[PDB]
Short mmCIF file of N, CA, C and O in Angstrom, two decimals:
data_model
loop_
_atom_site.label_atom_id
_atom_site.label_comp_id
_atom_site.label_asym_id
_atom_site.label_seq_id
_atom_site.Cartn_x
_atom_site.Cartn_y
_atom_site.Cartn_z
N UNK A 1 0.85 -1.22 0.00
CA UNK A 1 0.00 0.00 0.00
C UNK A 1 0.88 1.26 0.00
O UNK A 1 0.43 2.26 0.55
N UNK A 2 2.08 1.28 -0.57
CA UNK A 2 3.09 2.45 -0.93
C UNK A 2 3.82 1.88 -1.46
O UNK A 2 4.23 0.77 -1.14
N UNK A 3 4.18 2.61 -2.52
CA UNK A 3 5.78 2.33 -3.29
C UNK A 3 5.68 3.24 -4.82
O UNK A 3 4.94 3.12 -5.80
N UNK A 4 6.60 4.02 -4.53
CA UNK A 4 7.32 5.31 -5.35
C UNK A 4 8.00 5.05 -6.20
O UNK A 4 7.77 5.47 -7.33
N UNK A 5 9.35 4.06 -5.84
CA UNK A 5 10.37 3.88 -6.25
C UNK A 5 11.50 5.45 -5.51
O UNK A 5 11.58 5.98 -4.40
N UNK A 6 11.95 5.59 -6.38
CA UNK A 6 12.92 7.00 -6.00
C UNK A 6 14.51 6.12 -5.18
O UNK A 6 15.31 6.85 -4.61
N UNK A 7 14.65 5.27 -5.21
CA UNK A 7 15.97 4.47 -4.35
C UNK A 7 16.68 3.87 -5.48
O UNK A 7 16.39 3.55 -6.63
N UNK A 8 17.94 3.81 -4.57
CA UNK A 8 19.48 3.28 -5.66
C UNK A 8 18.61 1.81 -5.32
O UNK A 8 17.67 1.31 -4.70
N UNK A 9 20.07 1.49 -6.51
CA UNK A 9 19.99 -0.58 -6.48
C UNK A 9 19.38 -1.37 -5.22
O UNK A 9 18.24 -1.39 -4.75
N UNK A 10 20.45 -1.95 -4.89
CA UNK A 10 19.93 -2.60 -3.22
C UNK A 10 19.93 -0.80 -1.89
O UNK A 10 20.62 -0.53 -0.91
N UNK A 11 18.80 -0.03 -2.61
CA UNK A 11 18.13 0.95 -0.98
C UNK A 11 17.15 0.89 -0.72
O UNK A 11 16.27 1.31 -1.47
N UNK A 12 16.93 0.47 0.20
CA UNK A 12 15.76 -0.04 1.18
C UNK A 12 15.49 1.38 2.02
O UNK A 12 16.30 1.89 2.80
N UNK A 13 14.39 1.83 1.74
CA UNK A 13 13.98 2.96 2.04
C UNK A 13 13.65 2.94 3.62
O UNK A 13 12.89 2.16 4.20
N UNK A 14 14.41 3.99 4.18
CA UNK A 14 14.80 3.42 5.96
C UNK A 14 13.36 4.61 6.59
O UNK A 14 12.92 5.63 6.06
N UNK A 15 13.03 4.04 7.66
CA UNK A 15 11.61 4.67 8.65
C UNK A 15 11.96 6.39 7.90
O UNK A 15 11.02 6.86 7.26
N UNK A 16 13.04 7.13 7.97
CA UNK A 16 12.83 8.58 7.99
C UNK A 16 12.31 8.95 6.73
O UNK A 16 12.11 10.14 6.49
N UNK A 17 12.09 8.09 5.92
CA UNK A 17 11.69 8.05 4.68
C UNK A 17 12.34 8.14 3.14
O UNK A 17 11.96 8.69 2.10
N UNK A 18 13.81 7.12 3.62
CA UNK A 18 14.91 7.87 2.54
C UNK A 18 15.48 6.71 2.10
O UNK A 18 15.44 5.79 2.92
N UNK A 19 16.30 6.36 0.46
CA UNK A 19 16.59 5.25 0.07
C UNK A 19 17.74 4.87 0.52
O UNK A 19 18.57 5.31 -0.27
N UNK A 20 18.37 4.17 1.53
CA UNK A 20 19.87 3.72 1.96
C UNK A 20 19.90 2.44 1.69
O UNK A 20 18.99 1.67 1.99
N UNK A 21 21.30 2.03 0.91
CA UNK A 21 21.08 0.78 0.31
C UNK A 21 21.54 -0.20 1.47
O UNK A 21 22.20 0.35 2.34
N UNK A 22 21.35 -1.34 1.59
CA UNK A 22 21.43 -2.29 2.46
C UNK A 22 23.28 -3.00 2.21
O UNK A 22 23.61 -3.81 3.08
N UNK A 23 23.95 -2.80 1.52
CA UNK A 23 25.25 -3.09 0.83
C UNK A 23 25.79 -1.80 1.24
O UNK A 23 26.94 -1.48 0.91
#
């Protein structure tokens, strides 16, 4: 029930609402 996209390769978009990749 959300999804934008807007994140690098492996970023997992973290609670503050921002794409940080997990790697």
């Amino acid at each position: 029930e959300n999804f934008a996209g807007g994140c690098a390769t492996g970023f997992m978009r973290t609670a503050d609402g921002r794409c940080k990749p997990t790697f």
